[PDB]
Amino acid sequence: SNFKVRDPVIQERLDHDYAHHPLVARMNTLDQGNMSQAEYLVQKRHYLVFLIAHHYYEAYLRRMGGIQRRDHLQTLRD
Amino acid sequence: SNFKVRDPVIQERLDHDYAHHPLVARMNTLDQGNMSQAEYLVQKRHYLVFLIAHHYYEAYLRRMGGIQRRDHLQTLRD
Amino acid sequence: IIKIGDQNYDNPQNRATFINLRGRMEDLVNNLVNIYQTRVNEDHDERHVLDVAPLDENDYNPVLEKLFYYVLMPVCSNGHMCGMGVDYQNVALTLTYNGPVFADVVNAQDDILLHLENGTLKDILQAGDIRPTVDMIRVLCTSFLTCPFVTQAARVITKRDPAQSFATHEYGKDVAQTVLVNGFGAFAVADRSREAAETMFYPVPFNKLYADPLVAATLHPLLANYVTRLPNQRNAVVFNVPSNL
Amino acid sequence: LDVAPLDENDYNPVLEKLFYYVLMPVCSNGHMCGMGVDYQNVALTLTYN
Amino acid sequence: LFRTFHQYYMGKNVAFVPDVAQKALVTTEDLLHPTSHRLLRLEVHPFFD
Amino acid sequence: MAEYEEWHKSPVAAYAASCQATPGAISAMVSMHQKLSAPSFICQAKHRM
Amino acid sequence: VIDQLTIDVIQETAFDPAYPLFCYVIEAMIHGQEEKFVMNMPLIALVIQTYWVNSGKLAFVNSYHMVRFICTHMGNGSIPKEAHGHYRKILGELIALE
Amino acid sequence: TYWVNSGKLAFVNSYHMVRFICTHMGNGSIPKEAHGHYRKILGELIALEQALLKLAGHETVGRTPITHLVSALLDPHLLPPFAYHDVFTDLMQKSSRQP
């Protein structure tokens, strides 16, 4: 541990607890390669970090698109 | 009383008033030995102090175990 | 002479061969999986390329940036300032891998400690005792896309002003400076959450206004053992800088 | 001698010395005592009721 | 940098003091007192060091 | 206690009873714990104590 | 532009034995950017508002790329008014010094 | 209950109660008016030793620095008169003077 930051204390195996999730199927799409089984679950966990961050920012641009003219003024007619 | 702290004023005989308690059966498990009858009720009272403190701390670790993932997220489905 | 490690950096035509740019988050929605490819595959002990944002010649000026660091902060803090390095891909392993952030059943306009488990984020959010909402941490997840690598030290060797170009040896015409890229300066971390800072940050003393012993003795338990073995280095003046810095 | 072990993170010999020998007897004008406790009497008051 | 941080402070046992860092703690008179040569010999020039 | 054998003799407690509450009196107790020795005096003769 | 009471606020943040570690987590994620600071302005306006009330000190005093972006880009009543005056008197001083 | 009813604050007596109220419990679970008085204690008592290290020299004599000699506030042979964590094994291993 002389060349690394100490690992955090977080409960393991988020996949078996919830999903029911489409991006967990994307987690299986990452190939193992020459990595061992224990090292694969580390890098599969890191790849989940990238998928969640890409997901919420794509939802964020839809949120900050702003209110539009035509659909709002039509609902004001009623 | 020159070598001891003065005794507190507390009502006697907690066993006959409530129990109905499993640790009071544990109080009888302590053997009398060479102690007299009046001195046994003193040391039987001291042993009840140790049983209650051990009981509530064991319940305390179950309390500070923290909320878990799998059981909580399953109840959020409904 | 910008010394990024071993290879020098002479001319601005070599800019793409030593300095990687990362612009706006909005403009990089195409190249965004390409960024994560270099977070695992490439060796970050011999990368020799630093990461910065592209500069804006109309936004900032250096003098307003320079007076904040050399003047106002060492005086108002009596010189209690240490340089800090960040392991960024170990930071976002806390925030995203949460359980309330991941699952989409939990309400977005909800408090965090109603749903969070025993981990680091229960205790990092015990330090400030802040109650953000779920979306607030969810946007902090989104910073991991354009997030930089391990904080690198680039040393800047310039020639002196032509008033002062007289020295004995040949290197005495040049005076140097270290610029800690993609790190930040920081005060003493609270002792109640030293274990969390040990699992997120590491100190780099790199400048005489920012190499302070009694701040760095919080950030890593080896340097806390370095002070108690010999008490000669409890002062900011005397304190030993690594000669590799 | 029943004493909890020393962690070198939490231990500050200089600070406790400044508190006990300097700042306390001034602010108390030298009105302080050493306090003894019978610990097994403390639980019998707090718990047994 | 955490590798360069850790190679230098690992087994260090004796700490050095430079020439210039042991002049910035001295008062205005002890540098002129004749018990000190090396603190006084290396102040040859005003502009230089 | 044997009051002839400690670093805190009788007249420290005699000063501690008649202290003032002024923050200057905090500075008196800190400057009191100079050790009256020979290589202590070098540290005060430099700074003109 | 700096009065003595503002230094009495800045210096106590330096000698804070219970400084929030969470604003290092933000400043690592922000790392001084224009667009990235806009995305988290409903968060750091709460952290300051939960640190100016729990104690008299104010946070995010580490780097120039967090002090400057608070003053010039809010101009609002998100931060308490008593706290936001200290931030203007810092950048009132630096522009005066140049 | 004690800072609101009377104008005085408790737990002044031992150090370990004073220290832990500053580091832990940054909340408003105890009021902000009384919280400053605790922080002025440790905020100054850390500043007391900084002046002590300015008289104490940069230089040493042997293995023992001069800092261990000049003031009894720095001298580790003086012990704080209440021992909750074991100091006795620290002074035996470190010192060259026999305990």
Tab-separated table of N, CA and C in Angstrom, chain C residues 11-68:
chain	number	residue	atom	x	y	z
C	11	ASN	N	9.312	24.498	-27.221
C	11	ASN	CA	8.607	25.306	-28.198
C	11	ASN	C	7.107	25.060	-28.134
C	12	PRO	N	6.289	26.040	-28.529
C	12	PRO	CA	4.836	25.823	-28.533
C	12	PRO	C	4.347	24.895	-29.634
C	13	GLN	N	5.185	24.538	-30.614
C	13	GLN	CA	4.764	23.570	-31.624
C	13	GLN	C	4.654	22.158	-31.067
C	14	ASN	N	5.294	21.873	-29.935
C	14	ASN	CA	5.205	20.572	-29.295
C	14	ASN	C	4.072	20.495	-28.284
C	15	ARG	N	3.036	21.318	-28.448
C	15	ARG	CA	2.009	21.452	-27.421
C	15	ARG	C	1.134	20.209	-27.339
C	16	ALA	N	0.756	19.652	-28.490
C	16	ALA	CA	-0.064	18.448	-28.492
C	16	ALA	C	0.726	17.209	-28.101
C	17	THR	N	2.052	17.271	-28.148
C	17	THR	CA	2.880	16.130	-27.792
C	17	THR	C	3.264	16.106	-26.322
C	18	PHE	N	2.925	17.143	-25.559
C	18	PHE	CA	3.194	17.150	-24.128
C	18	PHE	C	2.033	17.621	-23.269
C	19	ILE	N	1.081	18.373	-23.811
C	19	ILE	CA	-0.023	18.929	-23.037
C	19	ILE	C	-1.328	18.489	-23.681
C	20	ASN	N	-2.153	17.784	-22.919
C	20	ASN	CA	-3.454	17.329	-23.379
C	20	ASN	C	-4.526	18.287	-22.877
C	21	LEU	N	-5.393	18.724	-23.783
C	21	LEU	CA	-6.486	19.616	-23.430
C	21	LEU	C	-7.765	18.829	-23.182
C	22	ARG	N	-8.595	19.355	-22.284
C	22	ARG	CA	-9.946	18.846	-22.063
C	22	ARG	C	-10.864	20.048	-21.937
C	23	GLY	N	-11.622	20.328	-22.992
C	23	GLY	CA	-12.443	21.519	-23.045
C	23	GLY	C	-13.738	21.416	-22.271
C	24	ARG	N	-14.813	21.936	-22.853
C	24	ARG	CA	-16.113	21.904	-22.208
C	24	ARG	C	-16.630	20.473	-22.111
C	25	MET	N	-17.463	20.237	-21.098
C	25	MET	CA	-18.119	18.941	-20.976
C	25	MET	C	-19.149	18.746	-22.081
C	26	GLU	N	-19.766	19.835	-22.542
C	26	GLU	CA	-20.813	19.725	-23.549
C	26	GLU	C	-20.241	19.400	-24.921
C	27	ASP	N	-19.047	19.896	-25.231
C	27	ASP	CA	-18.466	19.668	-26.545
C	27	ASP	C	-17.848	18.285	-26.696
C	28	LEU	N	-17.690	17.535	-25.611
C	28	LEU	CA	-17.007	16.248	-25.642
C	28	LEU	C	-17.962	15.084	-25.405
C	29	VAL	N	-19.178	15.161	-25.953
C	29	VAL	CA	-20.108	14.041	-25.826
C	29	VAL	C	-19.809	12.951	-26.846
C	30	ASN	N	-18.973	13.241	-27.844
C	30	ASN	CA	-18.556	12.228	-28.809
C	30	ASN	C	-17.353	11.443	-28.293
C	31	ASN	N	-16.331	12.147	-27.811
C	31	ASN	CA	-15.061	11.561	-27.395
C	31	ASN	C	-15.067	11.072	-25.955
C	32	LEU	N	-16.232	10.780	-25.379
C	32	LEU	CA	-16.333	10.669	-23.930
C	32	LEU	C	-16.019	9.264	-23.427
C	33	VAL	N	-16.163	8.245	-24.273
C	33	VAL	CA	-15.726	6.905	-23.895
C	33	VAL	C	-14.224	6.773	-24.133
C	34	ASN	N	-13.678	7.595	-25.031
C	34	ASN	CA	-12.242	7.624	-25.279
C	34	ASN	C	-11.471	8.129	-24.064
C	35	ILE	N	-12.110	8.946	-23.224
C	35	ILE	CA	-11.459	9.471	-22.029
C	35	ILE	C	-11.242	8.367	-21.001
C	36	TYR	N	-12.243	7.506	-20.805
C	36	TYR	CA	-12.115	6.429	-19.828
C	36	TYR	C	-11.146	5.344	-20.284
C	37	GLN	N	-10.852	5.269	-21.587
C	37	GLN	CA	-9.902	4.279	-22.084
C	37	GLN	C	-8.495	4.540	-21.565
C	38	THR	N	-8.126	5.805	-21.389
C	38	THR	CA	-6.812	6.145	-20.869
C	38	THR	C	-6.769	6.210	-19.349
C	39	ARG	N	-7.836	5.814	-18.655
C	39	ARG	CA	-7.791	5.796	-17.200
C	39	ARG	C	-7.344	4.459	-16.639
C	40	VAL	N	-7.343	3.407	-17.448
C	40	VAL	CA	-6.928	2.080	-17.018
C	40	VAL	C	-5.726	1.590	-17.819
C	41	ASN	N	-5.755	1.783	-19.140
C	41	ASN	CA	-4.791	1.127	-20.018
C	41	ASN	C	-3.403	1.747	-19.918
C	42	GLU	N	-3.324	3.062	-19.763
C	42	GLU	CA	-2.042	3.747	-19.803
C	42	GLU	C	-1.392	3.771	-18.427
C	43	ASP	N	-0.069	3.634	-18.417
C	43	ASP	CA	0.712	3.658	-17.187
C	43	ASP	C	0.861	5.107	-16.745
C	44	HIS	N	0.394	5.416	-15.535
C	44	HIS	CA	0.485	6.763	-14.991
C	44	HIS	C	1.685	6.948	-14.079
C	45	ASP	N	2.768	6.222	-14.331
C	45	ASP	CA	4.054	6.527	-13.731
C	45	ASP	C	5.050	7.039	-14.754
C	46	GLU	N	4.730	6.908	-16.036
C	46	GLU	CA	5.583	7.365	-17.122
C	46	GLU	C	4.692	7.939	-18.221
C	47	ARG	N	3.729	8.776	-17.841
C	47	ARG	CA	2.854	9.310	-18.876
C	47	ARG	C	3.494	10.500	-19.577
C	48	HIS	N	4.181	11.362	-18.816
C	48	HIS	CA	4.908	12.542	-19.302
C	48	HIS	C	4.017	13.532	-20.046
C	49	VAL	N	2.711	13.531	-19.774
C	49	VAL	CA	1.753	14.454	-20.379
C	49	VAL	C	0.763	14.870	-19.299
C	50	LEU	N	0.699	16.164	-19.010
C	50	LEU	CA	-0.204	16.710	-18.009
C	50	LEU	C	-1.535	17.109	-18.636
C	51	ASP	N	-2.554	17.242	-17.789
C	51	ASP	CA	-3.896	17.604	-18.225
C	51	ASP	C	-4.315	18.937	-17.635
C	52	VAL	N	-4.761	19.841	-18.501
C	52	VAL	CA	-5.278	21.143	-18.110
C	52	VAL	C	-6.527	21.432	-18.929
C	53	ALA	N	-7.273	22.422	-18.486
C	53	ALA	CA	-8.324	23.006	-19.297
C	53	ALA	C	-7.704	23.999	-20.277
C	54	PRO	N	-8.301	24.184	-21.457
C	54	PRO	CA	-7.761	25.177	-22.394
C	54	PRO	C	-7.969	26.585	-21.859
C	55	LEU	N	-6.918	27.394	-21.952
C	55	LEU	CA	-6.913	28.704	-21.326
C	55	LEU	C	-7.799	29.678	-22.092
C	56	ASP	N	-8.247	30.706	-21.380
C	56	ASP	CA	-9.069	31.766	-21.944
C	56	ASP	C	-8.350	33.085	-21.722
C	57	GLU	N	-7.903	33.708	-22.812
C	57	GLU	CA	-7.069	34.900	-22.733
C	57	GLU	C	-7.841	36.151	-22.331
C	58	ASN	N	-9.169	36.078	-22.242
C	58	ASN	CA	-9.997	37.202	-21.835
C	58	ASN	C	-10.648	37.006	-20.476
C	59	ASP	N	-10.544	35.816	-19.890
C	59	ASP	CA	-11.227	35.519	-18.640
C	59	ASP	C	-10.373	35.897	-17.437
C	60	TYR	N	-9.193	35.304	-17.309
C	60	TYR	CA	-8.378	35.500	-16.121
C	60	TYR	C	-7.198	36.426	-16.397
C	61	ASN	N	-6.552	36.833	-15.308
C	61	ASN	CA	-5.284	37.529	-15.300
C	61	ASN	C	-4.463	36.932	-14.164
C	62	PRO	N	-3.138	36.825	-14.321
C	62	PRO	CA	-2.358	36.091	-13.318
C	62	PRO	C	-2.182	36.851	-12.016
C	63	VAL	N	-2.221	38.187	-12.071
C	63	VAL	CA	-1.907	39.004	-10.901
C	63	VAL	C	-2.991	38.869	-9.837
C	64	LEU	N	-4.259	38.828	-10.253
C	64	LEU	CA	-5.333	38.546	-9.304
C	64	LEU	C	-5.269	37.117	-8.787
C	65	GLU	N	-4.696	36.203	-9.568
C	65	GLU	CA	-4.497	34.844	-9.088
C	65	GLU	C	-3.267	34.745	-8.204
C	66	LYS	N	-2.261	35.579	-8.455
C	66	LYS	CA	-0.994	35.466	-7.745
C	66	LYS	C	-1.066	36.080	-6.358
C	67	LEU	N	-1.822	37.167	-6.205
C	67	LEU	CA	-1.962	37.816	-4.910
C	67	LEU	C	-2.793	36.998	-3.940
C	68	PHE	N	-3.637	36.105	-4.438
C	68	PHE	CA	-4.406	35.256	-3.549
C	68	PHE	C	-3.545	34.207	-2.873
